[PDB]
Amino acid sequence: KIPRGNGPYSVGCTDLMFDHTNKGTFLRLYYPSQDNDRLDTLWIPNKEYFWGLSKFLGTHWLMGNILRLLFGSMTTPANWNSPLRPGEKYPLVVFSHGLGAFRTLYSAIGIDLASHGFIVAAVEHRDRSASATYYFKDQSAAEIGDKSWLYLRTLKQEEETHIRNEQVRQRAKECSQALSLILDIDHGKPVKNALDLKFDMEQLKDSIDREKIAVIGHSFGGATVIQTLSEDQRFRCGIALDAWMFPLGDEVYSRIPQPLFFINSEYFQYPANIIKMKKCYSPDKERKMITIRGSVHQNFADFTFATGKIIGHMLKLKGDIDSNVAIDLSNKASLAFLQKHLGLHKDFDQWDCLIEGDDENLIPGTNINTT
Ligand SMILES: CC(C)(C)[C@@H]1CC(=O)N(CCOc2ccc(F)c(C#N)c2)C1
Ligand SMILES: [Cl-]
Ligand SMILES: [Cl-]
Numbered sequence: 274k275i276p277r278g279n280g281p282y283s284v285g286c287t288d289l290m291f292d293h294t295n296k297g298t299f300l301r302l303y304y305p306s307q308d309n310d311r312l313d314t315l316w317i318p319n320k321e322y323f324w325g326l327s328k329f330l331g332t333h334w335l336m337g338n339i340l341r342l343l344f345g346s347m348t349t350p351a352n353w354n355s356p357l358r359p360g361e362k363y364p365l366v367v368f369s370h371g372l373g374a375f376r377t378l379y380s381a382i383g384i385d386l387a388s389h390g391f392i393v394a395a396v397e398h399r400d401r402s403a404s405a406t407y408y409f410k411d412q413s414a415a416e417i418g419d420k421s422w423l424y425l426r427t428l429k430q431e432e433e434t435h436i437r438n439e440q441v442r443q444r445a446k447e448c449s450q451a452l453s454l455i456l457d458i459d460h461g462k463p464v465k466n467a468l469d470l471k472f473d474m475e476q477l478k479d480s481i482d483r484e485k486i487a488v489i490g491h492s493f494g495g496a497t498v499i500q501t502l503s504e505d506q507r508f509r510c511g512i513a514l515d516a517w518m519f520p521l522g523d524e525v526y527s528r529i530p531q532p533l534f535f536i537n538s539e540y541f542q543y544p545a546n547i548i549k550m551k552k553c554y555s556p557d558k559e560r561k562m563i564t565i566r567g568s569v570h571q572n573f574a575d576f577t578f579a580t581g582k583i584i585g586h587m588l589k590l591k592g593d594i595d596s597n598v599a600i601d602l603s604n605k606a607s608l609a610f611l612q613k614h615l616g617l618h619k620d621f622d623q624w625d626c627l628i629e630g631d632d633e634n635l636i637p638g639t640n641i642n643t644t
Pocket of ligand 3 (some may be wrong): 543544545546
């Protein structure tokens with residue numbers, strides 16, 4: 274089971290695609306909900322994402338049907354298409370997923386943020402870094418739900434530098450576009466969702482605190498955070514979950530005015546990646562780093578919850594730390610960070626100690642030596 278949000282709000286979830294093209298926005302929305310009697314949200318909602326993950330794990334295509342059998346009926350604890358809790362303006366998080374992942378696989382994070390009063394827009398990237406994603410070739414195709422699927426691109430050694438940078442820049446554009454879309458919807462611009470779902474987007478009208486916007490993401494999405502911040506000042510701070518720094522150009526490091534928080538796993542990081550994180554530092558600017566003790570790279574994503582302890586540790590989905598304890602630390606620290614830098618009037622400052630790595634399961638800064 275993926276754990277429920279810890280906050281006071283019930284959580285809802287829906288999907289939005291606009292426009293219908295592979296240049297449009299596709300996102301999974303998590304939001305504070307009015308109602309709590311809806312069905313829970315299907316975690317991986319199409320067979321082709323499993324096919325996609327097979328290609329990502331670089332295994333027999335047949336392994337996609339096994340993954341489907343095991344996981345295809347699993348849900349995450351958010352009410353599907355629940356009405357939005359009215360009468361309050363909610364800060365907005367744009368969330369960027371990792372390589373081989375897609376929009377649905379960071380629900381633990383999305384759900385918990387929503388339960389504390391954020392609308393979270395988990396984007397699905399069309400840079401071919403997602404295991405799979407889909408779109409519609411034309412309007413008729415969208416109408417009848419005739420999906421066209423786009424799978425992960427596998428790179429040769431010598432394309433790596435160039436394409437990863439191309440991808441991370443496409444990712445930032447997609448975060449910006451997704452922001453512009455939600456803001457248009459906040460202002461009441463009628464949007465026809467290309468997905469034909471029973472969730473009225475006009476509920477979101479005047480529901481976004483338009484100044485209080487952040488970007489968060491895992492690994493390739495951690496790099497996306499940084500590129501996005503440098504390109505788009507509407508985002509007011511960012512949180513990088515175990516960022517993979519490779520895709521970023523050398524130019525960006527000195528070009529991040531907004532507060533930025535690195536939350537790392539213990540076992541993923543390495544000197545080359547940390548050195549790059551340290552290039553983002555400047556004493557005029559606001560930077561924090563913590564390391565979650567006993568954690569692995571996958572502790573930030575939902576699959577850390579999909580299997581048992583033993584098999585989870587076997588597949589490097591789980592670390593020595595308990596996955597719930599781990600994600601609580603990451604989520605609570607993030608919330609403290611968000612309250613400070615978006616200027617929120619909540620109680621998330623109770624976890625200010627977490628930002629500084631003051632916990633038995635936290636390391637301030639990093640365990641990685643780079644001198
Ligand atoms: C550091 C790299 C190995 C080069 C990549 C860069 C990157 O982005 N990585 C993280 C992916 O995370 C996922 C993927 C698929 C999932 F299904 C899930 C889940 N759940 C997480 C790892
Ligand atoms: Cl790891
Ligand atoms: Cl290294």
